[PDB]
Amino acid sequence: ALHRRVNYPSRAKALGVEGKVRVKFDITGSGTVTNVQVLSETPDGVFGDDVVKDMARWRYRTEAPVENQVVSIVFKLNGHIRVDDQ
Amino acid sequence: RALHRRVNYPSRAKALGVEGKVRVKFDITGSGTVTNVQVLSETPDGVFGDDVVKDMARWRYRTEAPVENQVVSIVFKLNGHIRVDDQ
Secondary structure (H helix, E strand, O other): OOEOOOOOOHHHHHHOOOEEEEEEEEEOOOOOEEEEEEEEEEOOOOOHHHHHHHHOOOEOOOOOOEEEEEEEEEEEEEEEEEEEEO | OEEEOOOOOOHHHHHHOOOEEEEEEEEEOOOOEEEEEEEEEEEOOOOOHHHHHHHHOOOEEOOOOOEEEEEEEEEEEEEEEEEEEEO
16 A cells, blocks of 8 residues: 545544444555445444545555455544643 | 643543643642642633542642642643554
């Protein structure tokens, strides 16, 4: 894989919503993604469509087409707390 | 002189995606424990203040003498984290 950028949807991030998407897909000889199948997403309706859009712009080593690849994408929010002395 | 100043992200704030900050005045006893804790301000209202006061009771300093009217600003942020895993 050259890049597999996934963005945190802004609504979900703003609402503190975490979750997980499992996706099956093919890679063309052009090393682009096709036949994108959402195997699961939680919570339902939140991350699936945005992940499918992001995957449209994924790039792999153009060589030989590969089929039935699976990835898990886990969306979390890391609490960060700083104590500033005044 | 601070040894331990752990602050936790309140569960409820975290689940709601709420960020913000608390400004607190407090004293430090000779035992290097924290006392006389007073919230000066918080945003948003009533989200972080009480949990920060609770956390600050367990704070620890190195000191040879009580110090008073110390001020801290405690800042709460939520950062996006995405893991892509091949299966």
